Write a protein that binds this ligand. Structure first.
Ligand code: B3N
Ligand code: K
Ligand code: K
Ligand code: ZN
Length: 349
């Protein structure tokens, strides 16, 4: 039975210092309104210790972050932000611990996925890279970890953490366009040194929809699985790809993301599920509730059930999201060229 990382205090903490308010409450409240929590093993998250956070971040960065939370320019830098970051990092580590111990094959921290943070630098509103911390916890048991990042943005912090190693392969599908954050992650970015070809990047343009996205994702993950043979997976599912997000870049629905998730779940590997960037509150809850249903194999009712935040689901009050009427800017020949480039990189793996 999947593990669901959750406590009322954790959700309150996540919404107190969140970049987007009440997002954690709405996601959990919708999952609860669909009664999906009854089909999962609810595990209270522990708070990450200083030593656990220092598995990736430097002592100087963690000490400075802890002080200002009580030369910030140097570390890419709010009251209480350190306890917030330690709570989210501890939640992802707790999920990874559940996977190590064989408590489950899928463990979910929807409030995690803060993929931009570097060892000594906050970045992209990420003060602590819980995805890296979770991978490093999984490295206690699993020899090869696959990190898949389906956020709108390039998972640069996670890729940079493992750029020099072949024990962790990072795969990011993201918007890539001059001026678009964080600006890295071209298909030519393949890692460095012993990690060369163990970073995979799929640059994508505005307006992609469910069918073409899944064709790209399935093609990449199929070749990655055969070449890399991962023993565990960490999957980042930032909902800022979803139609109606203020980012207004991709044109996805949770159904397309869900097919990517299903393809990974079929591998039967230990799988750590994370959230990520997401800026439409109601659509974020829609997406991650639906994806929770996919994890559980359950079909959900279309009408948003009556619950605390029902009035936020206008004007339609249904779970389904409709794509926006705007163009797909992705040229099929550019996409194929990217797929050819990646296939050639993975022959080296
Ligand atoms: C209030 N408002 C509309 C905004 C405030 C800040 C930014 C921004 O700094 N953007 C640059 C940093 C982008 C970080 C993206 C985080 C993300 O989703 N990563 O996956 C933009 C808009
Ligand atoms: K991504
Ligand atoms: K790597
Ligand atoms: Zn994002």
């Amino acid at each position: 039975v999947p593990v669901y990382i959750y406590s009322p205090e954790y959700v309150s903490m996540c919404d107190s210092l969140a970049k987007i308010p009440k997002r954690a409450s709405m996601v959990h409240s919708l999952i609860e309104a669909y009664a999906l929590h009854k089909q999962m093993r609810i595990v209270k998250p522990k708070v990450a210790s200083m030593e656990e956070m220092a598995t990736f971040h430097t002592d100087a960065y963690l000490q400075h972050l802890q002080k200002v939370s009580q030369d910030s320019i140097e570390y890419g830098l709010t009251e209480g932000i350190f306890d917030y970051a330690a709570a989210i990092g501890g939640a992802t580590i707790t999920a990874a611990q559940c996977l190590i111990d064989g408590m489950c094959k899928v463990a979910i921290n929807w409030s995690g996925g803060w993929h931009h943070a570097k060892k000594d630098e906050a970045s992209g509103f990420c003060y602590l890279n819980d995805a890296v911390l979770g991978i490093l916890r999984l490295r206690r048991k699993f020899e090869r970890i696959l990190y898949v990042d389906l956020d709108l943005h390039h998972g640069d912090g996670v890729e940079d953490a493992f750029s020099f190693t072949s024990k962790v392969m990072t795969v990011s599908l993201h918007k890539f366009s001059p001026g678009f954050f964080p600006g890295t992650g071209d298909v030519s970015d393949v890692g460095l040194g012993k990690g060369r070809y163990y970073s995979v990047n799929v640059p994508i343009q505005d307006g992609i929809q469910d069918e073409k996205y899944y064709q790209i994702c399935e093609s990449v993950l199929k070749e990655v699985y055969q070449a890399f043979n991962p023993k565990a997976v960490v999957l980042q599912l930032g909902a800022d790809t979803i139609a109606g997000d203020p980012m207004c870049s991709f044109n996805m629905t949770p159904v397309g993301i869900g097919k990517c998730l299903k393809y990974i779940l079929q591998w039967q590997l230990a799988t750590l599920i994370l959230g990520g960037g997401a800026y439409n509150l109601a659509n974020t809850a829609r997406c991650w509730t639906y994806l929770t249903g996919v994890i559980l194999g359950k079909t959900l009712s279309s009408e948003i059930p009556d619950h605390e935040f029902f009035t936020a689901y206008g004007p339609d009050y249904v779970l389904e999201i409709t794509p926006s009427c705007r163009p797909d800017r992705n040229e099929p020949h550019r996409i194929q060229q990217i797929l050819n480039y990646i296939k050639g990189n993975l022959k080296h793996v």
